[PDB]
Each structure stands twice: as structure tokens, then as C-alpha cells.
Structure 1
């Protein structure tokens, strides 16, 4: 079937290669997952050595981390907004590694109050935590709107899950300009 060998390619001289063996199982490839937004649906794949890979066909939830706070929370995916490979992947809502998505922001606002005592013995710790700590305006504006931009960090076709990290710093400003 699908193969990954170099026997069908041309040489650097441009000449043709004359093949003298049949295709081997140890060089196969498989069809892509093309994971899309939707209710969860996965299909296991039996790989070399007897191990299993999880091929995700549809996902709508994942683990997202707030790097500056060193915490993570499970939230729902809302939309796919940008993809550096092609616009057709945004149009079909395809989930691949390093694409930009918008996720639910409510659990992060809820954690912010419980850890800092701020709304967008324990009181004394709240005063301690506030010291030498501020919050970026660009992040804070998104939380009040209800949606926050994030970047997928897992490979849905290989592991079957869609985890990510919230965009901050100069990286956030880069993609905000591309969007508008």
C-alpha cells in the first residue's frame, strides 16, 4: 500500500531507479486522521511491536495550561481561528498541532478569584500572592469577553487528545494582527 521508501524517487542526477524487490511491511504508511471539532470519537490502531496508537476523529475538550501561573484546567473548544498551513483547514475546523483555537475562559476566571481573591488566614496569603504580581491587559480583556486564544501542543492523530497552552507575550500580538 502506502510506502515511505526512497526507491520511487529520482536520483540527484535525475536518473531513474530500477527496483528489484517487492514492498515491505516495515516501510508502510497509513491514511491521515483529519481530526475535526465535534463530539468525541476515536479509533485504536495496532502498531509495530504490539503497541496501540489512538486515532482521534472528533474532539471537543482538552487540557489547557496558563504558563505564567503554572496551572492547567480542562475546558471546551469553541472554534478554530488560524492555521499556518492552509485556510481550508480553518474552514473545515481541522485540529492539528500548532493551530490556534479559542477555548472557554470561565474556569480560568474562577481559579483567579480562588487563588488571588480578585474578580474580573486565607486573606493574608491573598495579600502575599498579590505582591510583585500583575496581569497582562491583553489577557485580561479576553477573559471578560468569555473566550481566550490558545495553541494546540499535542498531536491528535497520534495520541487522541487535544491539549494546549494559552497565548501570551509577543506571540499573542503576532497572531492578533494576522486575525485582523
Structure 2
């Protein structure tokens, strides 16, 4: 079938390699997943050793991490914003690793009110908020799009391999990199 060998590749001299075996099963590749936005549908793939590799088709949600705060929240993917491979993969809204997506931002605001106590008053007994909040500060570009409603984020998992759409929120120079390329 699809193979991953160098039998069809030309030599560095430019010479053709003459083939004297059949294709092996141990050198196969398989058809790509092309994971998109949509309600979750997965198909497992029986890999070597009997292990299962879960193809992701049509994913809509994942655990996205806010790395300065070292937390994650299960949020819902909204749109696919920028892809470094092609602009055609943005238009069909394919989920790959490292593509830039927008996520829900509601569990992140709610966590930022429950932890640090800052909204965008009720437990007067526990002001361990004051034990934090002094040294720590929050980047302004995060807090703008956090209250705007959707946060740009980066996919850190391989969905056709794992069947998950986990990610990380863009911070720092990495957010300021991709904000220039969009607008």
C-alpha cells in the first residue's frame, strides 16, 4: 500500500534503485485523518503490537492549558485562525498540531475570579488571595482577549494520532507573533 521506504527515492547520485522485494507490512503508512471542527467522531486504528491509534475526525473540544498559571480547562474550540503550512487548511478548518485556534475563554475567566479573586467578595474568611496576587501579574494581551470572549491558542497535540485536541494559550512574543500576521 502506502509505503515509507526509500526504494522509490533516487540515490544521491541520481541513479534509480532497482527493486528486488515486495512491499513489507512493516514499512506501511496510512491515509491522513484531516481532523476538522465538528461534533466528535473517532475511528480507532489497529497499530503494531495490537495497540490502538485513535483517528480524530470532527473534534470540537479539548483541554487547553494556561502555562503561566500551570492549569488547564476543558474548553470548546470556536474557529481555526492561522495555519503555518497553508492558508487552504484554515479555510477548510482542519485541526493539526501547531495550528492557531480560538477557544471559549469562559472557564479561564471564571477560574481567574475563583483563583486571585479578580473579576472582569463572598469568602471574607479566606483571603489567601492576598497571599498570592502581589508578586504575580498578568500580561495585558491575554486580559484583553480574555474579556473580549475568545482567546487565541495553539494546538499542542496530534489529533490524527491521539484523537485529542489539547492545546496551550498563546502568550508573550508568541501571541505578538501571530497577532501581527492576522491583522
Q: TM-score, normalised by structure 1?
A: 0.97
Tell me how far 1:124 sits from its aligned partner.
2.3
Tell me how far 1:13 sits from its aligned partner.
1.1
Question: Would the alpha carbon gap of residues 73 and 98 (structure 1) be closer, same or farther in structure 2, given more than 3 Å must change?
Answer: same
Tell me how far 1:123 sits from its aligned partner.
4.0
- Correspondence 1:150 to 2:156: no
2:141 to 138, 141, 144: 138
Tell me how far 1:20 sits from its aligned partner.
1.0
Aligned length: 180
Provide structure 2 residue ranges, at least 5 long, that are not aligned to the other structure: none
Alignment deviations for residues 105-163 of structure 1 (CA, whole Å, 9 cap, x no partner)? 11111011111111116542111111112111111110111000100000000000000
Question: Would the alpha carbon gap of residues 50 and 112 (structure 1) be closer, same or farther in structure 2, given more than 3 Å must change?
Answer: same
Task: Give the match's secondary structure for 1:154.
Answer: coil
Distance 2:108 2:114 in 1: 10
Distance 2:136 2:14 in 1: 62
Superposition CA RMSD, Å: 0.9
Distance 2:2 2:47 in 1: 15
Distance 2:125 2:158 in 1: 40
Distance 2:169 2:24 in 1: 43
Distance 1:70 1:20 in 2: 54
Question: Would the alpha carbon gap of residues 122 and 37 (structure 1) be closer, same or farther in structure 2, given more than 3 Å must change?
Answer: farther
Alignment deviations for residues 77-96 of structure 1 (CA, whole Å, 9 cap, x no partner)? 00000000001000000000
Provide structure 1 residue ranges, at least 5 long, that are not aligned to the other structure: none
Q: Which moved more, 1:63-72 or 1:12-21?
A: 12-21
Question: Would the alpha carbon gap of residues 89 and 122 (structure 1) be closer, same or farther in structure 2, given more than 3 Å must change?
Answer: farther
Distance 2:83 2:125 in 1: 43
Q: Which runs of 4+ in 1 moved over 2 A?
A: 121-124
Distance 1:17 1:124 in 2: 73
Tell me how far 1:9 sits from its aligned partner.
1.0
